[PDB]
């Protein structure tokens, strides 16, 4: 009676039928050791903070203990505030922000310091950084600070506020010089439409050196770059060839082939890999809570989400000592959290592609910062 | 409009008592009420603002609480300067109807009413009137009854009663009764009696005079 | 310290005007608002009206066509004009200062003046003495009294030996009968002082300015 | 009696004092406002949500208050769903959010017009990340369109415990490109700290240039960079040459410091002036409702803020449509609004610093 | 001198109390630990000449 | 705050040594000087000696060859060594710090410890009761007493019912006769409490640690 077999886990999702639902259900399907995690998912819009707040309070009043979900630019600091107030941990594969606390577990690793390492490898002075309007605020900050430190000339280009005639005028300005160094940072569902816009203009391809700052470089539709001068170089967290990730690949292919699963495959996503590894983190954390013989009590008989004053649930810090000490080698490689709730001890590969040449330059980490191969 | 009311009309307390004064309203005012003190001369000052805070200039001995329609002011220790009339004022809707108001009083020993009856003077009888006076001084509390008798017959007409405030020295009270009649009504009666009924004695103290 | 003082004529005829003057000090009347309120004897206090620091003025809904307010910031005075007075205007008038302290509060109020609206004529009072009659020394303190009957209007000032004898002085309030004021005063002197010492009661009526001394 | 809600940050003493002055000054005869004051935090969205639901439980018709950059989307979402208007003197947002009425006009377009008047190509831009990143994206788009050299550096990521070697390294790295020109975009406290550190390291002599990108250019201490020699520009919304503004200062400086904290000054902060103007705007709108004979009266039974589905009440939709129908004259000059909630037909003075003090050189509007 | 340190103008002067001595350091260690209410002008790291 | 407490043996034989320890707090003994002084009962207080912060030390002119001073700045303690003790050494000892405030003054003094120099032997005391004799209730308060005779050395701790009965406790001081201490203690209990409630006097002699309880 130290721990019940059913631990309620709240979940928040933007879509009804997507790849992340199947990845989350498969990641819960491997649970054979006690306790069993009962999912309580909410298919909710993310851009409305009222609906996100109401689903958060409904899951908190229903009696969850850890919430796994996603957020957006309009929900970067509301969830951080509610989780720092109610002392309830939130685990997410979304874009990492600068200001956070110990309760927000950002599964996606950092990206700006690897970009600094690549630009230091190629020794650039003048280039054009295209940023997404939804997440280009933390990476663009460090890029402009490094440009001020190392005397660079960065031309910042927004995506949302610029119309297609603005794109025509900016590339008309960029086609007046010899070398054309462009670094694009946006999400892949936007990057498909952006690269569809670009390939009607890069028919020459001479001098166009692109860097797509994204962990899903193998997932980008690069078939529009055929017979072009694409100097495109990207990052990769999971290239799906290592023995334990290929074992996980074989496991979910067998779980597909046994009876059935949800929405299909062969175009994977790194967000699904982060989802699987985060649910594995939560499973190892509840197994650590079970094998340390620490009880998790509850008195939530329709507990109020919004009270005056705040009532801190004091058991959650034990969960903070359970989720932080998770240490393994999963589908995204070395899975390990720091003291602040971000990814530490991780490795990002650098892949350059030109004229059907899939070449591995080297890798990147935090101690031997960037090495080639 | 919004009718304000207070059940307590006169409160009795001593020096150093945590006295509470409650107040009710016709509806919820969302704690938009104030408590003010008014001295016996007529000068009024503010004591507690917004039913929970204290104004700059008042001491830290008073406070307030309450919710909905039921508010209350509280005093930790009553002082000599704290002997005043407490009034509640609501500020929800126009017109701002104030409370009924309560009056504090100092508790002392229950003293018997010293009664003194005086007949009319000869100069008043030369004008055609006669005002028999009855002074009941040094009594505690103010609950007392007066009865006039003209040769055994109780008379209720022509009786005037005047009550005074509590003295700040002995914490007692004084009352005046006046029986005003004509000269022919005063000459037709010989014995006039005044009876004072107090809480200290179940039998009324009777003071009688002959002619 | 901020102090407010209300003053008026006191005695006014029916269906006439009434000018009340409220003098405030210790603060400034250019940034705060004033409020004039009435108080009936034995009934609840009602708010008559209010004026703001910016010139806005409002009144009650029942007598909005009977009250007006003017102000002078140089003398810090508030003049309240009330017309169409009736017999039920024998009340008190008070003036207070308004403020915003998360609620519309009344912080600094005044003393308030008594206005008696009657068509009677001002007459001087009649003073009569009152002794115990019997010369039996029941105690060391003997009480005497003075009755001022037939006065108009209220109030008067009754003192004992020009304010020298202040031991056991029991001054009572006045009553009204047939538009005539009747007041009583009592003094408690020693048994050996009366009648060895002169005890004279002085009654001053400010309506007729009548000074009456009665030993 | 109109019940409204009021949210104020812990530390806003001058703004609440000007709010009290505006509530005493703009009292009407037909009705009376009743603010419910909630002095809670502004960065913690949990306390902001608690104060919002506490004001919504009282059944209010409008909510006044500030918001932080970490809580702007929370305010826009909670005020767009429940269809309750929100009047604010805080920074402008990126988008047309319903039921959000703002008191601060645009600062980005005035700054771009000032650069295009001063005929510049290369400068530094020391900004702060507490009011969004709108002006930064605007000047980066204008630098991409006009081929400028902008060295854009944030300064808000530096603590108050080691802000002596970081600022020295920052202004040493700014001397690598020999930057003779820095535009400062910080709040009312960080501007004074940066100017004090510049005076400490000695970078205010004739040869440099500075622009204080705020509405309260006279709110900071300018006696310390008056005799320096570097001509300093800025923007002002409170023109002290107006008769109404001079009368408000004459009624402001004579107030008690203990009765009104932060009111015994010769000047006034721009947020306090926008609060005093917003009180006039709300009073004029509620007077227009009292004059149009529109009955929207209800009680304090609006329900819980977390109702599913949270049903709106349609008579609030007119209230925002009333707020767009307000064109008055206050301390910010003309006040006229659009259908979205932004300010139109406004005027901002451009102040340059002379030897004798601040001197106006001209004005700027959006139609010219 | 903390206000004319980072300016760039070079500053010379004369000193009579060398703070690098042992007896001076012992006197400063016995000086800065004194109560200001008992000894006014004593809670400093330096001392006037 | 600065404090000082003196401690020692209290009882020692003649022609022997005497080590007193003065513990000071609230300040430091590295930059100030410390003086030690004696005090006879009923006579004038005399300064024994002084030591400076810089190692300088001086003594009185009468007993310069009988006192020595040392200090431990780590414990902030002062050790006073006194030899050649006579029969007139039954005195008190105190310690103080020196300061300059336009004059050489003693700023923070101590409580002082009592030293009795005698060659007598330590023996346990003898407790005897003392009642009023007559049981006539002259008042509501009845007084009882305990006489502790034959004690060595001074003093002892005399309480009533382990410090619970502290109403009207009149403990008298001890006297010396033939090197024997005689003390008396008196308590005032109610008339109905005795002999209904047990009032037991507890005398603890710390020289022999003798605890005697007498009901
Ligand atoms: C999740 O909720 C958000 C918040 O309401 C939704 O975003 C909103 O989308 C509508 C689309 O009609 C926007 O309204 C209008 O957009 C047009 C675009 O041309 C614009 O011209 C209008 O002025 C108006 O803005 C609305 O602005 C937008 N709100 C926000 C905060 O972005 C979103 O669509 C919802 N998603 C789902 C899947 O339900
Ligand atoms: C990264 O985490 C650990 C803190 O415990 C520190 O070093 C790492 O220690 C682990 C021990 O489990 C090493 O893992 C080992 O890897 C080898 C293969 O190389 C495997 O055969 C072993 O069974 C074991 O799993 C790991 O290599 C080692 N280093 C790194 C870079 O992770 C270290 O303090 C942490 N890094 C930082 C920057 O603090
Ligand atoms: C002070 O502001 C002026 C802009 O009004 C800057 O530019 C000067 O403009 C005047 C025209 O009125 C020219 O005559 C000067 O030659 C300009 N200065 C230079 C250096 O060319 C001026 O640079 C500003 N001062 C500083 C120190 O930056
Ligand atoms: C004044 O500041 C300058 C900093 O350069 C120093 O004096 C210089 O020393 C160099 C040594 O070769 C010589 O060129 C001159 O004596 C100085 N330079 C110039 C341009 O005058 C020194 O550190 C400072 N203090 C002094 C001179 O007392
Ligand atoms: C970039 O692309 C051009 C295409 O003409 C190719 O010639 C060049 O080698 C590429 N550079 C690198 C570093 O791959
Ligand atoms: C702006 O306001 C002024 C002042 O009333 C007015 O004269 C002018 O016509 C207005 N302009 C516009 C475009 O509304």
Q: How far is CA B73 from CA B85, B90, C99, C159, F126, in A?
A: 12, 14, 20, 39, 64
Closest among F133, F134, F149 to F184, alpha carbons compared: F149
**Whether the Cβ atoms of residue F148 and residue F156 lie closer than 8 Å to each other:** yes
Closest among D69, D70, D74 to D52, alpha carbons compared: D74
Instruction: Tell me the C-alpha distance between A241 and A251, whole Å.
Output: 14
Which residue minimizes the CA distance to atom 6 of ligand 5? A229
Closest among B137, B139, E26 to C187, alpha carbons compared: B137
**Whether the Cβ atoms of residue B2 and residue B92 lie closer than 8 Å to each other:** yes
Instruction: Tell me the C-alpha distance between C185 and C200, whole Å.
Output: 12
Q: How far is E10 from chain F (nearest CA, A)?
A: 39
B58 inside domain: yes
**Whether the Cβ atoms of residue F143 and residue F132 lie closer than 8 Å to each other:** yes
Quick check: do D and E touch, 3+ CB pairs under 8 A?
yes
Instruction: Tell me the C-alpha distance between D329 and D324, whole Å.
Output: 15
Length of chain E: 49
Question: Residues 6 or more apart from A369 whose CB is under 8 A from it?
Answer: A113, A117
B147 inside domain: yes
The number of folded domains in chain B is 2
B197 inside domain: yes
Instruction: Tell me how far apart the terminal alpha carbons of chain A are, to the nearest angstrom.
Output: 54
Does the beta carbon of E33 lie under 8 angstroms from any beta carbon of chain F?
A: yes
Within chain E, residue ranges assigned H as helices are: 22-31
Instruction: Tell me the C-alpha distance between F132 and F186, whole Å.
Output: 11
| Residues from chain D contacting residue C33 (CB–CB below 8 Å) | 24, 27
Closest-lying ligand 3 atom to the alpha carbon of residue D180? 28
| ω into D177 cis (within 30 of 0) | no
Same domain, B126 and B200: yes
For the record, the structure tokens of A59 come out as 């899951």
Within F19-109, residue ranges assigned H as helices are: none
Instruction: Tell me the C-alpha distance between A146 and A119, whole Å.
Output: 10
Give the chain E residue whose CA is nearest to the CA of F107: E38
For the record, the structure tokens of A76 come out as 């970067």
Instruction: Tell me the C-alpha distance between A209 and A229, whole Å.
Output: 9
User: Measured over all CA atoms, what is the biggest interatomic distance in chain A, rounded to whole angstroms?
Assistant: 74
* Experimental resolution (Å): 6.5
Does the beta carbon of D39 lie under 8 angstroms from any beta carbon of chain C?
A: no
B94 inside domain: yes
Same domain, B147 and B166: yes
Give the chain D residue whose CA is nearest to the CA of B91: D34
B112 inside domain: no
Question: Residues 6 or more apart from E14 whose CB is under 8 A from it?
Answer: none
What is the span of the domain harbouring residue B54? 5-106
* Rg of chain A, C-alpha, whole Å: 22
B111 inside domain: no
Place of tokens 């024997």: F180
**Whether the Cβ atoms of residue D8 and residue D15 lie closer than 8 Å to each other:** yes
Same domain, B94 and B137: no
Instruction: Tell me the C-alpha distance between D155 and D157, whole Å.
Output: 6
Which residue minimizes the CA distance to atom 8 of ligand 5? A231
Q: Which of B106, B129, B163 corresponds to the end of one domain?
A: B106
**Whether the Cβ atoms of residue C109 and residue B43 lie closer than 8 Å to each other:** yes
Does residue C189 sit in helix, strand or coil? strand
Does the beta carbon of E6 lie under 8 angstroms from any beta carbon of chain D?
A: yes
Helix (H) or strand (E) holding D172: helix D165-173
Instruction: Tell me the C-alpha distance between D346 and D337, whole Å.
Output: 10
Same domain, B172 and B130: yes
**Whether the Cβ atoms of residue D260 and residue D21 lie closer than 8 Å to each other:** yes
How far is Cα of residue C75 from the mean position of the Cα atoms in its chain? 23
B78 inside domain: yes
Contact D251 C100 (CB under 8 A): no
Same domain, B22 and B88: yes
Same domain, B144 and B61: no
Within chain A, residue ranges assigned H as helices are: 19-29, 49-62, 78-86, 112-122, 139-150, 164-174, 188-198, 243-258, 270-291, 316-323
Same domain, B147 and B89: no
Q: Which residues pair with C70 in a beta bridge?
A: C79
Does residue F191 sit in helix, strand or coil? coil
8-state DSSP, D258? T
**Whether the Cβ atoms of residue F71 and residue F79 lie closer than 8 Å to each other:** yes
Task: Give all strands (DSSP E) within chain C, no chain letters.
Answer: 3-7, 11-12, 18-25, 33-39, 46-51, 57-59, 67-72, 77-82, 91-100, 104-109, 113-117, 126-130, 141-151, 157-160, 170-171, 175-177, 180-190, 201-205, 210-214
Same domain, B9 and B100: yes
Same domain, B17 and B98: yes
CA angle D168, D169, D171 (to 5 degrees): 65
| Stretch 96-125 of chain C: residues touching chain B, C-beta under 8 Å | 96, 101-112
Quick check: do A and C touch, 3+ CB pairs under 8 A?
no
Q: Which of B54, B83, B106 corresponds to the end of one domain?
A: B106
Same domain, B95 and B174: no
| Stretch 22-61 of chain F: residues touching chain E, C-beta under 8 Å | 28, 30-31
Closest among D34, D8, D13 to B31, alpha carbons compared: D34
Closest among B46, D260, D254, B81 to C1, alpha carbons compared: B46
The structure was resolved experimentally with: cryo-EM
**Whether the Cβ atoms of residue D163 and residue D198 lie closer than 8 Å to each other:** no
Within B66-195, residue ranges assigned H as helices are: 122-127, 183-187
Burial category of F24 from C-beta neighbours within 10 Å (exposed 0-12, middle 13-18, buried 19 and up): buried
Question: What phi and psi values does residue B126 have, to the nearest 5 degrees?
Answer: -70, -20
| Residues from chain D contacting residue C98 (CB–CB below 8 Å) | 24
Quick check: do A and E touch, 3+ CB pairs under 8 A?
no
Same domain, B84 and B158: no
B90 inside domain: yes
CATH number for the domain including B70?
2.60.40.10
Probe target for ligand 5 pocket from A229, A359, A361, with the most ligand atoms within 8 Å of CB: A229
Q: How far is D121 from chain E (nearest CA, A)?
A: 28
Q: How far is CA C130 from CA B121, B151, C127, D300, in A?
A: 6, 21, 10, 65
Instruction: Tell me the C-alpha distance between D102 and D98, whole Å.
Output: 11
Instruction: Tell me the C-alpha distance between C37 and C47, whole Å.
Output: 4
Instruction: Tell me the C-alpha distance between D273 and A332, whole Å.
Output: 54
Probe target for ligand 6 pocket from D345, D347, D365, D368, with the most ligand atoms within 8 Å of CB: D345
Place of tokens 């949302």: A160
Q: How far is CA D19 from CA A198, C27, C33, F190, in A?
A: 54, 20, 16, 69
For the record, the structure tokens of A158 come out as 């927004």
Question: Which chains does chain F touch, 3 or more C-beta pairs < 8 A?
Answer: E
C178 CA to centre of ligand 2 in angstroms: 108
Same domain, B97 and B133: no
Does residue D182 sit in helix, strand or coil? strand
Burial category of A184 from C-beta neighbours within 10 Å (exposed 0-12, middle 13-18, buried 19 and up): buried
| ω into F99 cis (within 30 of 0) | no
Closest among A50, A57, A81, A71 to D79, alpha carbons compared: A50
Q: How far is CA D331 from CA A219, D268, D276, D281, in A?
A: 57, 11, 8, 11
Which residue minimizes the CA distance to atom 11 of ligand 6? D345
Q: Which of B80, B106, B132 corresponds to the end of one domain?
A: B106
Helix (H) or strand (E) holding A347: none
Length of chain C: 215
């Amino acid at each position: 009676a130290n721990f019940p077999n059913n631990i309620q886990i709240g979940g928040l999702f933007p879509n009804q039928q997507s790849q992340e639902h199947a990845a989350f259900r498969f990641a819960l399907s491997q649970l054979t050791e006690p306790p069993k995690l009962l999912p309580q998912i909410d298919i909710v819009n993310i851009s409305d903070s009222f609906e996100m707040t109401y689903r958060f309070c409904s899951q908190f009043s229903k009696g969850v203990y850890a919430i796994f979900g996603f957020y957006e630019r309009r929900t970067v600091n509301m969830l951080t505030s509610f989780c720092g107030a109610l002392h309830v941990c939130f685990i997410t594969p979304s874009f990492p922000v600068d200001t956070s606390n110990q309760f927000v577990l950002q599964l996606r690793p950092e990206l700006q310091e690897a970009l600094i390492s690549i630009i230091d490898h190629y020794k650039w002075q003048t280039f054009v950084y295209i940023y997404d309007a939804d997440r280009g605020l933390s990476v663009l900050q460090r890029v402009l600070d490094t440009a001020a430190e190392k005397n660079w000339q960065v031309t910042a280009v927004n995506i949302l506020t610029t119309t297609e005639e603005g794109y025509r005028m900016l590339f008309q300005d960029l086609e007046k010089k010899k070398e054309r160094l462009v670094v694009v940072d946006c999400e892949s569902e936007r990057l498909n439409a952006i690269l569809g816009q670009i390939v009607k203009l890069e028919k020459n391809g001479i001098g166009y050196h692109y860097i797509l700052a994204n962990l899903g470089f193998m997932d980008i539709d690069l078939n529009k770059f055929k017979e072009s001068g694409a100097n495109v170089t990207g990052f990769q967290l999971v290239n799906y060839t290592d023995t334990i990730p290929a074992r996980i690949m074989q496991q979910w292919r067998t779980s597909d082939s046994r009876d059935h699963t949800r929405v299909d495959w062969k175009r994977p996503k790194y967000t699904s890999a982060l989802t699987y590894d985060g649910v594995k983190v939560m499973a190892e954390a509840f197994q650590s809570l079970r094998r340390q013989r620490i009880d998790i009590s509850r008195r939530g008989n329709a507990g109020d989400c919004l009270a005056n004053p705040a009532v801190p649930w004091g058991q959650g810090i034990d969960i903070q000592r359970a989720l932080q000490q998770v240490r393994f080698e999963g589908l995204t490689g070395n899975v390990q959290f720091n003291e602040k709730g971000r990814r530490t001890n991780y490795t990002l590969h650098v892949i350059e592609m030109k004229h059907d040449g899939i070449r591995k330059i080297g890798y990147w980490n935090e101690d031997d910062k960037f090495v080639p191969a | 409009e919004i009718q304000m009311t207070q059940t307590t009309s006169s409160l009795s307390a001593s020096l150093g008592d945590r006295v509470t004064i409650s107040c009710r309203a016709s509806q919820d005012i969302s704690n938009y009420l104030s408590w003010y003190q008014q001295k016996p001369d007529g000068t009024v000052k503010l004591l507690i603002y917004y039913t929970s805070r204290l104004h700059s200039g008042v001491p830290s001995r008073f406070s307030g609480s309450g919710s909905g329609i039921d508010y209350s002011l509280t005093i930790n220790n009553l002082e000599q300067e704290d002997f005043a009339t407490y009034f509640c004022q609501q500020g929800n809707t126009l017109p701002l109807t104030f409370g009924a108001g309560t009056k504090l009083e100092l508790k002392r020993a229950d003293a018997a009413p010293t009664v003194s009856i005086f007949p009319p003077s000869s100069e008043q009888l030369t004008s055609g009137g006669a005002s028999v006076v009855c002074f009941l001084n040094n009594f505690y509390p103010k609950d007392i009854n007066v009865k006039w008798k003209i040769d055994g017959s109780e008379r209720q007409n022509g009786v005037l009663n005047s009550w005074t405030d509590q003295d700040s020295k002995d914490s007692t009270y004084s009352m005046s009764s006046t029986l005003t009649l004509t000269k022919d009504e005063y000459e037709r009666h010989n014995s006039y009696t005044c009876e004072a009924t107090h809480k200290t004695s179940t039998s009324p103290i009777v003071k009688s005079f002959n002619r | 310290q901020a102090q407010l003082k209300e003053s008026g004529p006191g005695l006014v005829a029916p269906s006439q005007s009434l000018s009340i003057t409220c003098t405030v000090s210790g603060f400034s009347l250019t940034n705060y608002g004033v409020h004039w309120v009435r108080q009936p004897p034995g009934k609840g206090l009602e708010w008559l009206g209010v004026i703001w620091a910016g010139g806005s003025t409002n009144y009650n809904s029942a007598l909005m066509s009977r009250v007006s307010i003017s102000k002078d910031n140089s003398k810090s005075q508030v003049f309240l004009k009330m017309n169409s007075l009736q017999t039920d205007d024998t009340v008190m008038y008070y003036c207070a200062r308004e403020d915003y302290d998360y609620d519309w509060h009344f912080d600094v109020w005044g003393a308030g003046t008594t206005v008696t609206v009657s068509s009677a004529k001002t007459t001087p009072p009649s003073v009569y003495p009152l002794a115990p009659g019997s010369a039996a020394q029941t105690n060391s303190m003997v009480t005497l009294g003075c009755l001022v009957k037939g006065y108009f209007p209220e109030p008067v000032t009754v003192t004992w030996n020009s304010g020298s004898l202040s031991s056991g002085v029991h001054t009572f309030p006045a009553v009204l009968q047939s538009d005539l004021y009747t007041l009583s005063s009592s003094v408690t002197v020693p048994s050996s002082t009366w009648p060895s010492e002169t005890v004279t009661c002085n009654v001053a009526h400010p309506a007729s300015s009548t000074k009456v001394d009665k030993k | 009696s109109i019940q409204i809600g009021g949210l104020f940050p812990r530390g806003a003493d001058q703004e609440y004092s000007a709010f009290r002055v505006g509530m005493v000054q703009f009292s009407t005869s037909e009705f009376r406002l009743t603010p419910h004051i909630d002095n809670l935090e502004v960065a913690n969205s949990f306390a902001v949500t608690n104060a919002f639901c506490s004001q919504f439980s009282r059944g209010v018709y409008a909510i006044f208050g500030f918001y932080d950059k970490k809580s702007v989307n929370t305010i826009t979402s909670f005020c767009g769903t429940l269809h309750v208007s929100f009047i604010t003197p805080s920074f402008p947002t990126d988008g047309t959010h319903p039921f959000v009425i703002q008191m601060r006009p645009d600062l980005k377009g005035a700054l771009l017009s000032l650069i295009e008047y001063y005929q510049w190509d290369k400068f530094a831009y020391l900004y702060d990340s507490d009011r969004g990143l709108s002006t930064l994206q605007a000047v980066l788009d204008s630098a991409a369109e006009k081929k400028w050299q902008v060295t854009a550096i944030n300064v808000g990521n530096i603590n108050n415990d080691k802000k002596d070697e970081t600022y020295r390294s920052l202004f040493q790295d700014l001397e690598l490109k020999k930057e003779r020109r820095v535009i400062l975009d910080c709040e009312r406290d960080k501007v004074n700290d940066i100017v004090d550190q510049v005076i400490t390291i000695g970078k205010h002599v004739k040869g440099y240039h500075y622009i204080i990108a705020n509405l309260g250019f006279t709110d900071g201490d300018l006696l310390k960079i008056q005799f320096g020699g570097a001509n300093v520009s800025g923007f002002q919304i409170v023109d002290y040459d107006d008769s109404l503004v001079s009368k408000f200062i004459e009624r402001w400086s004579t107030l008690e410091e203990k009765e009104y904290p932060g009111a015994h000054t010769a000047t006034i902060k721009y947020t306090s002036a926008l609060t005093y103007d917003a009180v006039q705007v709300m009073t004029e709108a509620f007077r227009n409702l009292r004059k149009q004979r529109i009955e929207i009266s209800r009680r304090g039974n609006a329900g819980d803020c977390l109702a599913n589905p949270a049903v709106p009440w349609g008579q609030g939709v007119e209230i925002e449509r009333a707020l767009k129908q307000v064109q008055v004259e206050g301390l910010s000059g003309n006040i006229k609004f659009d259908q979205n909630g932004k300010r139109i037909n406004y005027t901002i003075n451009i102040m340059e610093l002379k030897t004798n003090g601040p001197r106006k050189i001209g004005y700027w509007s959006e139609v010219d």
